[PDB]
């Protein structure tokens, strides 16, 4: 067996917490899909966590998944967004590396950034521009 | 499984009422384009400020050279093909789809299912950018109409 280890850039072992992410915009499962589309349109976000009234993360709503579900005849604009909760997305820790982040971002369009306290807490969303801006700046 | 089976069997009668409407129902934004001589770092700043994931790269006459995308910029940076001071001309992406205002929303839907965007070109002048179109443009139309 032969192994290869790449030479890593300066930022590789720096941590997700260096990016300076804001708190996420989240939605309740009971607002409509149409209302969620306006919110996401206003902000220029492709996704948001869906959280219940007790603060539990139920999953993510994404534009891709809303579009698929609409095409499949399964959701309409006036339905609750709870109907299109996407439950399989990637998580990363606030103290995980930018290297790990970069792997996730190459395969997925976002990750939910998590931090461990007495329970596992959501810190924010992270997407390619957050990493790009950091490296560029 | 069974749902895919149903959607395949009745694909024709499950086509949305708007399937054969045209992309021009969407009324898009004016496009933000860049020349190939601005840097990758400045491209990243511009796209960050607007909240766009992609822009057309055009020449001094407005002729489309291709697209710059965040995903391809990231890959190119990871592979060491460019650094931020390099011209964005070094990462012109060409494997995207162009469509016209007269193309159906159905054609657009197929494209958006696989890619993050399409480039809308001028109906009789396919070398010029009309606008960019992404999922939220189609979603916004359907929510408006329903
Ligand atoms: C403006 S959006 C542009 C589109 C991009 N594909 C996206 O969805 O992030 C990019 C910026 O918004 C942030 N962002 C995305 N979704 C978020 C949300 N639900 N809450 C707060 N920030 C979010 C990203 O972390 C990034 O800083
Ligand atoms: C604010 S962005 C949000 C993130 C989304 N993933 C994207 O890149 O379009 C969505 C809106 O910006 C528009 N848009 C995207 N790229 C653009 C560009 N280069 N010039 C003008 N509008 C653009 C889209 O057509 C859509 O109306």
> Which atom belonging to ligand 1 lies closest to the Cα atom of A133?
27
Kindly state whether A132 is in contact with chain B, defined as any CB-CB distance less than 8 angstroms: yes
> Which atom belonging to ligand 2 lies closest to the Cα atom of B133?
25
Over its C-alpha atoms, chain A yields an Rg (Å, rounded) of 17
- Report the gap between the CA of A117 and the closest CA in chain B (Å): 31
Resolution (Å) of this entry: 1.7
DSSP H or E segment with residue A26: none
Structure token pair of residue B107: 């054609």
DSSP H or E segment with residue A108: none
Check residue A20 and give left, alpha or beta (phi > 0: left; psi -120 to 50: alpha). left
Q: Is the dihedral of CA B53, A34, B144, B8 positive or negative?
A: positive
DSSP A38: H
CB contact under 8 A, B7 and A41: no
User: Which one of A132, A134, A135 would you mutate to disrupt binding with B, by most B Cβ within 10 Å of its Cβ?
Assistant: A132
Interface A-B, measured as beta-carbon pairs within 8 A, has a size of: 80
Query: Distance between CA atoms of B103 and B101, rounded to whole angstroms?
Result: 6
Query: Distance between CA atoms of B3 and B16, rounded to whole angstroms?
Result: 17
DSSP A72: T
Q: How was this structure determined?
A: X-ray
Residue B4: C-alpha distances to residues A73, A76, B106 (Å) = 12, 18, 18
- What's the B133 CA to ligand 2 centre distance in angstroms? 7
- Angle B135-145/A63-71 helices, nearest 10 degrees? 50
Domain definitions of chain B by residue range: 1-146
CB distance A85 to A108 below 8 Å: no
With DSSP H G I counted as helix, E B as strand and the rest as coil, what are the percentages for chain A, rounded to 5?
35, 25, 40
DSSP H or E segment with residue A80: none
Residues linked to residue A115 through DSSP beta bridges, in sequence order: A121
**Pairing status of strand A120-126 against strand A111-116:** antiparallel
CB distance B139 to A67 below 8 Å: yes
With a CB-CB cutoff of 8 Å, which residues 12-71 of chain A face chain B? 33-34, 37-38, 40-41, 43-44, 46, 63-64, 66-68, 70-71
DSSP H or E segment with residue A11: none
User: Any idea which architecture B1-146 has in CATH?
Assistant: Roll (3.10)
**The 3-state secondary structure of chain B, one letter per residue:** CHHHHHHHHCHHHHCCCCCCCEHHHHCCCCCCCECCCCEHHHHHHHHHHHCCCEEEEECCCCCEEEEEEHHHHHHHHHCCCCCCCCEHHHHCECCCCEEECCCEHHHHHHHHHHCCCEEEEECCEEEEEEEEECHHHHHHHHHHHC
CB distance B65 to B145 below 8 Å: no
List the Cα angle A81/A86/A91 in 5-degree steps: 130
Kindly state whether B75 is in contact with chain A, defined as any CB-CB distance less than 8 angstroms: yes
Domain A1-137 has CATH 3.10.580.10: yes
Kindly state whether B146 is in contact with chain A, defined as any CB-CB distance less than 8 angstroms: yes
Q: Smallest Cα–Cα separation from B131: which of B30, B23, B22, B52? A: B30
Kindly state whether A84 is in contact with chain B, defined as any CB-CB distance less than 8 angstroms: no
């Amino acid at each position: 067996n032969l192994y290869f280890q790449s030479m890593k850039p300066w930022w590789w072992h720096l941590r997700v917490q260096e990016l300076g992410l804001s708190a996420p915009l989240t939605v309740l499962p009971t607002i409509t899909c149409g209302h969620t589309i306006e919110i996401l349109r206003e902000k220029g976000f492709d996704q948001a966590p869906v959280v219940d009234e007790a603060g539990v993360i139920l999953g993510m709503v994404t534009l891709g998944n809303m579009l698929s579900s609409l095409l499949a005849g399964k959701v309409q604009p006036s339905d609750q967004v709870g109907k299109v909760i996407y439950k399989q997305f990637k998580q990363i820790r606030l103290t995980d590396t930018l290297g790990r982040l970069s792997h996730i971002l190459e395969m997925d369009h976002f990750a939910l950034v998590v931090h461990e306290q007495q329970r596992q807490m959501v810190f924010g969303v992270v997407t390619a521009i957050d990493l790009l801006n950091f490296v560029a700046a």
